Design a protein around this ligand. Structure first.
Ligand SMILES: [K+]
Ligand SMILES: [K+]
Ligand SMILES: [K+]
Ligand SMILES: [K+]
Ligand SMILES: [Mg+2]
Ligand SMILES: [Mg+2]
Length: 260
C-alpha cells in the first residue's frame, strides 16, 4: 500500500477521485490484483462482476522483489488469468498502460505508484458492504500536484510504502510541499535539518524508487485475453464434490454466470 495516499488525494486532488456504482462499469475489462483480493468468495465476487458486464482478468503475484485451485476455478468459469513475473499490481498497471484493460482493481494504492493510469478500489468488496467503487485517475493527480511520475514516486515513498522506510515526523501534506519545492528525496535530505528530521539509516529509497519506475512486469501482448462460457458440470463437480460447497449455491451462481 501507500499510507495516507487515498485521504491525501481526496484532500488536495479531489478531481482525481470518482465514486461510481458497480453498474456503471458495463463492458469494461479490469485487471484484478489476485493476492489483494476463499474459493467461494472468488466465485461470488467474479459472478457479481460478470452480472454487471465487467470482464475481469486475474493477475497472480510472481516472485516478490528483494494458487492452483483458484486458477482451476477460473478456467472452469471461463475467466482468464495471468501469472505476473513479480508484483501483480505492477503488471495490472502495465495492462492498463498497454490498453488491454480499462483499469486495475486492487486495494493497494501503490498501483498508482507503479504508474497505472486508472485504479479502481472496492470492486472485490462483498455486495452487502454497500461500498461504491472508488476510481482514481493518475494523470489528474500529477496535474493537480504539478508533479511528474518520478516526483510522485518519491512522494509515495515519503508517505510510506511496502519497500522502504519513510522519514519519521514528515506528514502527508508536508511531504507534498517538500516534493513540490525540492523535487527529489536526495535534495530533500540536503535541505532538512538532521537534528529535527533524521532520515532512516541504510535507507533504501533509491532501490524502492527504481522498483516503482522499472518494475518487472508481464508483456501485455504475449497472451490474448479471452472470456468464454463456463464448464458447468465440471464446475459443480469441483466446487461441490471436491470442495464440499453447496450444490444449490453453486448451481444458482452458475446459472447467473451463464445468464450474464
Ligand atoms: K477518476
Ligand atoms: K517522471
Ligand atoms: K529516491
Ligand atoms: K511489458
Ligand atoms: Mg505492494
Ligand atoms: Mg500485493
Amino acid at each position: 500500500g501507500i499510507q495516507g495516499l487515498a485521504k491525501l488525494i481526496a484532500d488536495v486532488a479531489p478531481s482525481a477521485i470518482r465514486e461510481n456504482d458497480i453498474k456503471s462499469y458495463f463492458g469494461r475489462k479490469v485487471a484484478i490484483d489476485a493476492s489483494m483480493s476463499h474459493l467461494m468468495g472468488m466465485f461470488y465476487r467474479t459472478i457479481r462482476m460478470m452480472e454487471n458486464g465487467i470482464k475481469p482478468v486475474y493477475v497472480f503475484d510472481g516472485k516478490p522483489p528483494q494458487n492452483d485451485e483458484c486458477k482451476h476455478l477460473l478456467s472452469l468459469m471461463g475467466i482468464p488469468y495471468l501469472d505476473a513475473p513479480s508484483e501483480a499490481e505492477a503488471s495490472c498497471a502495465a495492462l492498463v498502460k498497454a490498453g488491454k484493460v480499462y483499469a486495475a482493481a486492487t486495494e493497494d494504492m501503490d498501483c498508482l505508484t507503479f504508474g497505472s493510469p486508472v485504479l479502481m478500489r472496492h470492486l472485490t468488496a462483498s455486495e452487502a458492504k454497500k461500498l461504491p467503487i472508488q476510481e482514481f485517475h493518475l494523470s489528474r493527480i500529477l496535474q493537480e500536484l504539478g508533479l511528474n511520475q518520478e516526483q510522485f514516486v518519491d512522494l509515495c515513498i515519503l508517505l510510506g510504502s511496502d519497500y522502504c522506510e519513510s522519514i519519521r515526523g514528515i506528514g502527508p501534506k508536508r511531504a507534498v510541499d517538500l516534493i513540490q519545492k525540492h523535487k527529489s528525496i536526495e535534495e530533500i535530505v540536503r535541505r532538512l535539518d538532521p537534528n529535527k528530521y533524521p532520515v532512516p539509516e541504510n535507507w533504501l529509497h533509491k532501490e524502492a524508487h527504481q522498483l516503482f519506475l522499472e518494475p518487472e512486469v508481464l508483456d501485455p501482448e504475449s497472451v490474448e485475453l479471452k472470456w468464454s462460457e463456463p464448464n458447468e458440470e465440471e464446475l459443480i463437480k469441483f466446487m461441490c464434490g471436491e470442495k464440499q460447497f453447496s450444490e444449490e449455491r453453486i448451481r444458482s451462481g452458475v446459472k447467473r454466470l451463464s445468464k450474464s
